[PDB]
RNA sequence: AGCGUGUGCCUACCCUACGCCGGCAGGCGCGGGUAACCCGUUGAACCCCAUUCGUGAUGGGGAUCGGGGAUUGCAAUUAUUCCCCAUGAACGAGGAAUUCCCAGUAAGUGCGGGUCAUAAGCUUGCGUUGAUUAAGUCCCUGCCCUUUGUACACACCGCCCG
RNA sequence: AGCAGAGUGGCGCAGCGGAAGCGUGCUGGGCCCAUAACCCAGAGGUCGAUGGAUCGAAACCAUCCUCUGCUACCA
């Protein structure tokens, strides 16, 4: 985090309230801020051993030197709502083999982890091949 | 009868007096036909005549009833935008401000650099759609020697 | 040993099984089937049906 | 209007009337149905009757795309599905070619079943509206029978010459 | 320098007073069990400059420049 004017100040407070209020809110007040799909995941779910992640983040954030980010906490979980408390941590997210590391911004809140790590090569081409049409055939 | 005036200019788009009132107004972006048949009735005027038959006094009221819809008791769900996101309110966006707002949300999703902004910048479909047989601009491919 | 061996199967194509051997792929439910379409044919003679049309 | 279908089944699940709340998706309270018994006297679409639009890429077309609301699930991101507002593209009757069809038939139009925790532009059946053209021929494509010719029998997609 | 041609819109040749003309090629489609032959479909765009008539100009007509073809000299 090194941004400005994306969740406080002139230009942008997160739906009319700063980050500072969010951290003191419970999930209950927080979810009522419009983002419909989020509200399912909280009201139904209520912690199905996401315990393992959220303690490591706070822990590592605490022990890390001031003006320096922690190491990483890794996940195979690509699903979990990005939240204000999570911000400032650094998380590696499993793809099919690779843990792509990302810094968490206060501007990413509401989204999932898995949107910030891709799981395919964008694509290049190409040079059409042989049978790539109604012409390829014959040899002997 | 009624030779008084025809084509005119209003905010950001030129609106003809040739067409009926509701349908004339739709040309302005952020206003569909569904949005206009409401706003005319809140203004309590005919929609059964042409747009060139409105007076200046009348059309002055139209834009006020349009741009403060909550204060003239058009419901929140009936707006374009409910809690924009990071602005904190219900809003109604019209022609040249719509584009400015739109370009921000594109920029935002490449700022965070989600899956969205990458698909935008690459010029590929955002939503769940196959691109294998969808598109073409391109198709000239050869392989012989 | 282990503390897991399973994960929720409660709906979908994996929580029902067809009676060949516990075969699948060949999604089947009809009128209380649970009976595989390949073998259904072999039980055209057997009772449940005789072909008439 | 018709063929059907429906919880008590697989392991956790059906079809819904009625009352109440919401613009809508939907929520909530009660009741029936093992079914010619309850949903359902299946109060469906095209069609029919009256307004509005006017030859204009138009209010035809609804692709693309932004924001928001619901439902299923252990989980919905590369948007499961559904709803609301906004955005408004190609396309103005289609080359060379080619498919299918003879009477409740073609075509138009809706519905049930199948897969199904959530979900048909598919497939399988069913009703509804309902023409034009033919009553023939071997021209093309192909098939049956006889006669004839053959260097073919891996059978003309054959064999074979410089 | 005398005469002639041209100054691409894929190629090569450059067709005429209506914005690619001809020939060819490449790429794709069609026909066929398949190939050849045969039949169709393409492609961002004052076509060196300065002007006039013109609805318009590689193309209707001029004034200039350059490159080449044939002829051929000033240097």
UniProtKB/Swiss-Prot annotation, chain A:
One GO CC term, this protein: cytosolic small ribosomal subunit
One Pfam family recorded for the sequence: Ribosomal_S19
GO MF terms held by the record: MDM2/MDM4 family protein binding; RNA binding; structural constituent of ribosome; ubiquitin ligase inhibitor activity
SUPFAM superfamilies recorded: Ribosomal protein S19
Principal subcellular localisation of the protein: cytoplasm
Gene3D superfamilies: 30s Ribosomal Protein S19, Chain A
UniProt xrefs under InterPro entries: Ribosomal_uS19, Ribosomal_uS19_CS, Ribosomal_uS19_euk/arc, Ribosomal_uS19_SF
Cross-link Glycyl lysine isopeptide (Lys-Gly) (interchain with G-Cter in SUMO2): where in chain: 105
A biological process from GO: positive regulation of signal transduction by p53 class mediator
UniProt subcellular location: Cytoplasm
Keywords, alphabetical: Acetylation, Cytoplasm, Isopeptide bond, Ribonucleoprotein, Ribosomal protein, Ubl conjugation
Disulfide bonds: none
Oligomer status and interactors: Component of the small ribosomal subunit.
Task of the protein: Component of the small ribosomal subunit. The ribosome is a large ribonucleoprotein complex responsible for the synthesis of proteins in the cell.
PANTHER family given in the database record: RIBOSOMAL PROTEIN S19P FAMILY MEMBER, SMALL RIBOSOMAL SUBUNIT PROTEIN US19
Family, similarity comment: Belongs to the universal ribosomal protein uS19 family.
Protein name from the UniProt record: Small ribosomal subunit protein uS19
Organism: Oryctolagus cuniculus
Swiss-Prot record, chain B:
Major localisation: cytoplasm
UniProt keyword rRNA processing, yes or no: no
Record GO cellular component, one term: cytosolic ribosome
Disulfide links within the chain: none
Keywords: Acetylation, Cytoplasm, Isopeptide bond, Ribonucleoprotein, Ribosomal protein, RNA-binding, rRNA-binding, Ubl conjugation
Keyword RNA-binding: yes
GO biological process, one term: translation
Modified residues (N6-acetyllysine): 89, 101
One GO MF term: rRNA binding
PROSITE patterns: RIBOSOMAL_S13_1 (PS00646), RIBOSOMAL_S13_2 (PS50159)
Localisation: Cytoplasm
Pfam families for the chain: Ribosomal_S13
Gene3D superfamilies named in the record: 1.10.8.50, 30s ribosomal protein s13, domain 2
Record-listed cross-link Glycyl lysine isopeptide (Lys-Gly) (interchain with G-Cter in SUMO2), residues: 86, 89, 101
Function comment: Component of the small ribosomal subunit. The ribosome is a large ribonucleoprotein complex responsible for the synthesis of proteins in the cell.
Subunit structure: Component of the small ribosomal subunit.
Family: Belongs to the universal ribosomal protein uS13 family.
The protein, known as: Small ribosomal subunit protein uS13
Swiss-Prot record, chain C:
UniProt-annotated location(s): Cytoplasm, Cytosol; Cytoplasm; Rough endoplasmic reticulum
Organism superkingdom: Eukaryota
Cofactor: Zn(2+)
GO cellular component: cytosolic ribosome; cytosolic small ribosomal subunit; rough endoplasmic reticulum
Cofactor binding remark: Binds 1 zinc ion per subunit.
Residue positions where Omega-N-methylarginine is found in the record: 9
Residues modified to Phosphoserine: 6
Molecular function terms from GO: structural constituent of ribosome; zinc ion binding
Binding site for Zn(2+): 18, 21, 36, 39
Sites of N6-acetyllysine modification: 45
Keywords annotated in UniProt: Acetylation, Cytoplasm, Endoplasmic reticulum, Metal-binding, Methylation, Phosphoprotein, Ribonucleoprotein, Ribosomal protein, Zinc
Main location: cytoplasm
Gene Ontology BP term (one): cytoplasmic translation
Family annotation (Pfam families): Ribosomal_S14 (PF00253)
Function: Component of the small ribosomal subunit. The ribosome is a large ribonucleoprotein complex responsible for the synthesis of proteins in the cell.
Quaternary organization: Component of the 40S small ribosomal subunit.
Family: Belongs to the universal ribosomal protein uS14 family.
Protein name per UniProt: Small ribosomal subunit protein uS14
């Amino acid at each position: 985090v090194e941004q400005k004017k994306k969740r406080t100040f002139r230009k942008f407070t997160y739906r009319g309230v700063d980050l500072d209020q969010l951290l003191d809110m419970s999930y209950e007040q927080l979810m009522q801020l419009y983002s419909a799909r989020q509200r399912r995941r909280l009201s139904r779910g209520l912690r199905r051993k996401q315990h393992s992640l959220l303690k490591r983040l706070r822990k590592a954030k605490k022990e890390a030197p001031p003006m320096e980010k922690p190491e990483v906490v890794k996940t195979h979980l690509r699903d979990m709502i990005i939240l204000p408390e999570m911000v400032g941590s650094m998380v590696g997210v499993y793809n099919g083999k690779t843990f792509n590391q990302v810094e968490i911004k206060p501007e990413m809140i509401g989204h999932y982890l898995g949107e910030f790590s891709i799981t395919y090569k964008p694509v290049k081409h190409g040079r059409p091949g042989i049978g790539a049409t109604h012409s390829s055939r014959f040899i002997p | 009868p009624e030779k008084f005036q025809h084509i005119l200019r209003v905010l950001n788009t030129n609106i003809d007096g040739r067409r009926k009132i509701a349908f004339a107004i739709t040309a302005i972006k952020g206003v569909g036909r569904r949005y206009a048949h409401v706003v005319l009735r809140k203004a309590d005027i005919d929609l059964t005549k042409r747009a060139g038959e409105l007076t200046e006094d009348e059309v002055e009221r139209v834009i006020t009833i349009m741009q403060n819809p909550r204060q003239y008791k058009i419901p929140d769900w009936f707006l374009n935008r409910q809690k924009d996101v990071k602005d904190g309110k219900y809003s109604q966006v019209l022609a040249n401000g719509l584009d400015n707002k739109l370009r921000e949300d594109l920029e935002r999703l490449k700022k965070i650099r989600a899956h969205r902004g990458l698909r935008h910048f690459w010029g590929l479909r955002v939503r769940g759609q196959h691109t294998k047989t969808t598109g073409r601009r391109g198709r000239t491919v050869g392989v012989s020697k | 040993q282990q503390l897991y061996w399973s994960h929720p199967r409660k709906f979908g194509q994996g929580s029902r099984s067809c009676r060949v051997c516990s075969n699948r792929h060949g999604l089947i439910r009809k009128y209380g089937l649970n009976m595989c379409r390949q073998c259904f044919r072999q039980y055209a003679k057997d009772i449940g049906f005789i072909k008439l049309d």
